[PDB]
Design a protein around this ligand. Structure first.
Ligand SMILES: O[C@H]1CN[C@@H](c2nc(-c3ccc(C(F)(F)F)cc3)no2)C1
Length: 330
């Protein structure tokens, strides 16, 4: 089997991407944030504290004839930014772009933190990291991809995020019309439960390529590109007026600037992030100071190839017995 679904930026800055997902019988369609950096599928629901729901579409398990409460199961998760959610668990039928999984764990939120409440466009998350990260207790549950894998034509999914434009998540096949040149594959460590890999280095604009190992995770659920302080300093040094602002919480730059591209290595291959991908607009409405899309990972503990990097590529998440990651230009 295969699946194919369009993913859409939630706003004009590509802060996140949502993808329609059919849950239950009859289908309840929710727009979920596909996150290759986590492994829970959770949703706003009829069980979510009313004051914490503000415009989201909710899952009502009582209206699904295939929903079954998973007895005694709870979940609780915190994301990289400090946001969180928790609740109980149903199993139900879940379909993405024509690909259907029966008995998928659907984690129903009883509580969500303020940043989720304030984001009316995100109805929940669909985790696509390895199932070892799943937070359901006392019996850990499998991700949607994990459940679907054996039935797929090929045990893969691909991420084709758009820049200020829609894109595509495919399951079970590689669309050879969706990229240019070849796909370069690189090794993955699953030891931490992430799609963790090592980039072979970087270039800033038309500058020479620096060969250096940069370990990081491919994380569709993170907006920006977080890289070592040395690398990030080298980038913003090429932008007149750019500086790190402690009060803003990162590198900012004059909105009148022209940003240089940023290249990262995948083996001997190179992925070029155009400069305007790195522009995340005025730090506050009406400001002429803009927020940078490349930021230091120093306070994080790991490097994160978020959407700023991934949207510049066609990305293969290969879930074979020994997982790998593939990158192609597009
Ligand atoms: O957890 C790490 C693994 N993947 C990254 C991730 N973080 C989110 C996220 C989604 C929505 C929000 C909110 F709407 F603003 F609340 C916050 C964070 N989704 O994936 C970071």
């Amino acid at each position: 089997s295969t699946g194919s679904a369009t993913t859409t930026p939630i706003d004009s800055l590509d802060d996140a991407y949502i993808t329609p997902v059919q849950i239950g019988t009859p289908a309840q369609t929710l727009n979920l944030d596909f996150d290759t950096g986590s492994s829970d599928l959770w949703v706003f629901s009829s069980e979510t504290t009313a004051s914490e729901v503000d415009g989201q579409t909710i899952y009502t398990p009582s209206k699904s004839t295939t929903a079954k409460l998973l007895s005694g199961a709870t979940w609780s998760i915190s994301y990289g930014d400090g946001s969180s959610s928790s609740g109980d668990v149903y199993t139900d039928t879940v379909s993405v772009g024509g690909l259907t999984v029966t008995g998928q764990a659907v984690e129903s939120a009883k509580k969500v933190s303020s940043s989720f409440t304030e984001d009316s466009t995100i109805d929940g998350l669909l985790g696509l990291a390895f199932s070892t990260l799943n937070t359901v207790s006392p019996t850990q549950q499998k991700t949607f991809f994990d459940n679907a894998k054996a039935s797929l034509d090929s045990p893969v999914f691909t991420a084709d995020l758009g820049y200020h434009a829609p894109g595509t998540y495919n399951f079970g096949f590689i669309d050879t019309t969706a990229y240019t040149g070849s796909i370069t594959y690189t090794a993955v460590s699953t030891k931490q439960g992430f799609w963790e890999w090592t980039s072979t280095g970087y270039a800033v604009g038309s500058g020479t390529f620096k060969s250096t190992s940069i370990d990081g995770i491919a994380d569709t659920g993170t907006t920006l590109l977080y890289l070592p302080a040395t690398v990030v300093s080298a980038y913003w040094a090429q932008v007149s007026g750019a500086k790190s602002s402690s009060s803003v919480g990162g590198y900012v730059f004059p909105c009148s600037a022209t940003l240089p591209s940023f290249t990262f290595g995948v083996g001997s291959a190179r992925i070029v992030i155009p400069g305007d991908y790195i522009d995340f607009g005025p730090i506050s409405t009406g400001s002429s100071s803009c927020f940078g899309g490349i930021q230091s990972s120093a306070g994080i503990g790991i490097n994160i190839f978020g959407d700023v990097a991934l949207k510049a590529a066609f990305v293969v998440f290969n879930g074979a017995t020994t997982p790998t990651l593939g990158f192609a230009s597009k």
